[PDB]
Chains A and B, each alone.
Chain A
Amino acid sequence: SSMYSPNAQYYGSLHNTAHVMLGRQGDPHGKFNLPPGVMEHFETATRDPSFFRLHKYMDNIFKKHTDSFPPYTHDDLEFAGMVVDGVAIDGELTTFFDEFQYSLINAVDSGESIEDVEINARVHRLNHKEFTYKITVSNSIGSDHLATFRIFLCPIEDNNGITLTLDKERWLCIELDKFFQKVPSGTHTIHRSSKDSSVTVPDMPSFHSLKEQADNAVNGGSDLDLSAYERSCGIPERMLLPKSKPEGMEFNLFVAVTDGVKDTEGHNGDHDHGGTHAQCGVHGEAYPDNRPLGYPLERRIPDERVFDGVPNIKHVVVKIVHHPE
């Protein structure tokens, strides 16, 4: 729970206490002088497999609430006069592992009056090749209109080879992008690069790089456009796509185009929302999208006919291939 809780005396702090409960299971009675578990730091918690069992448990609590609302109707979902004619991607969807280095110098003891030496860790990390979405829309209103583009990747089959219904897919879908763009009258193709995702941020610049850039500016006088780096909150760009398999896997790419005027009311459409607003919001500003998080996949969809009848929603099959070493 957070300090926004209306009643912590009654509702307690389920999630934060659970982190400690799990983290301490190696020494639950303090007999062994063991330090806190990996679950007791946000730096480390996702290293523990139990992180995801705990958070699925918590996720299902939220899901009982979100499932309690009536399914969306045609009128709920329709962006009148906006149809998605096609969805395609420029570039193959390819994942691989590459190598990344970071410095261990801060971990080791130095001094006094003894020189340092370069000490690095090299890790293998998931990555993917660049691609660009091609989303063809037709705006059959006689005016340009702001639209929200909501992009999700959804499984088609489970690990047993069983084809999933839309209701069984929706809670498994992962957010790939969300952006606001003016759609002029007529039929037009919207292009969106994978690198520009509002879900992701680039790899952090190294400490050594930050020192070099700051030192070069201070010792001299140079206004470096530091307004370049994203934020550190956001799924790493390299992890935008799931690993998939060497033999390839097919997924549903789900695109919902919604009324940007209504979605952004109170926060403007032309305004800059930063590079990570989908899950990390906008630093020092209100959250720019009024819709429920997960829209339009966050309510039950018992009747797939409802979604199929909405011209501003479309999904297509895409293939992701893993390229092993």
Chain B
Amino acid sequence: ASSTAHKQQDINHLLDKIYEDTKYPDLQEIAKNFNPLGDTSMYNDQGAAAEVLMKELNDHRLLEQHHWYSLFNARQREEALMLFAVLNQCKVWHCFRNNAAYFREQMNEGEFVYALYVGVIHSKLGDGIVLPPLYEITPHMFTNSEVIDKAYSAKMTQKAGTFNVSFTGTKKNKEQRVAYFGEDIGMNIHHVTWHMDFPFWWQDSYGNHLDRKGELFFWVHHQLTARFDFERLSNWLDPVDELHWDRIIREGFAPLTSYKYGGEFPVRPDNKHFEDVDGVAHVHDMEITENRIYEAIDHGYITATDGHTIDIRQPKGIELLGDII
């Protein structure tokens, strides 16, 4: 029941054809009849997390299915983490499986996929499971619009096919020379999995501490940056400049990619100045935040909420900077 074979098959089934109601009769039956609140002894918190999520569901406060999802959207992230919190409290696999099946059919698919992945990664119940590659679970997030269009045409015409992916832009765009780095599907899996392993929303009340996370955050991104610059050097290009909030972003981008639901990803023109983003931040807020971080660095200490100093002139200083940055 909780053998590796059954848990793996359950996860495979839950992630199969994620944009449609489940086609597996056993999962259909669970989603119809299981009650996340029916027996709260299955949870290490006696049902607190399930109560939170069920109240949001019953009050019609959750993001609808067939809608874009972004982990950087505060409310959508909070909704995905409500499901993660339920899965994380499950004592045994049948709780994990049944809640996953129940909420798969109620919740936005992007939120669901995210919660199930981090639930598997951060629960002991997920030990031994191999998560399918996200580029086959949500291929729109890893595949350009031209190839997706060819897939839609194959499906409309009921014909199989294999379609070649090319890079975006043209040869006139020198940045295309290094598209094989940031568009590589495995490099993108590396990146999302690092953040799934070391999420910025992690709280140790979820079960365990993530050792040196803030320093690993610095290091993994330093390595992405240094590796990209090595590809630029390999292709007769100069190193990337750094962004600054008061200077133009020289290199624009046309993704030529689309969401499954939500439309095409937006383009950014060349040589644009940063503008304030309504509901996110003013450009000036970013500059102030940057200044405050540099104040801590140049002071040698981070300032606590009550004004006391937290020394960063020690080996953990870089980690604490990762935490606040």
Spell out A's residues near B (CB within 8 Å).
Answer: 160-162
Contacts and interface: CB of A to CB of B under 8 A. Distances in A.
Chain A: interface secondary structure?
loop
Contacts of A161: 171
6 contacts: A160-B171, A160-B172, A160-B174, A161-B171, A162-B171, A162-B172
A160 B171 CA distance: 6
Interface of B: 171-172, 174
A161 B171 CA distance: 7
A321 B90 CA distance: 70
Contacts of A162: 171-172
Contacts of B174: 160
Contacts of A160: 171-172, 174
A227 B172 CA distance: 51
A160 B174 CA distance: 7
Nearest to A162: B171
A168 to B, nearest CB: 13
A114 to B, nearest CB: 53
Contacts of B171: 160-162
B50 to A, nearest CB: 58
Nearest to B172: A160
A160 B172 CA distance: 6
B163 to A, nearest CB: 24
Nearest to A157: B171
A162 B172 CA distance: 8
B151 to A, nearest CB: 29
Nearest to B173: A160
Closest 4 CB pairs between A and B?
A160-B171, A162-B171, A160-B172, A161-B171
Nearest to B236: A159
A302 B173 CA distance: 25
Contacts of B172: 160, 162
A161 B170 CA distance: 11
Nearest to B174: A160
A165 to B, nearest CB: 15
Nearest to B176: A160
Nearest to A161: B171
A3 to B, nearest CB: 44
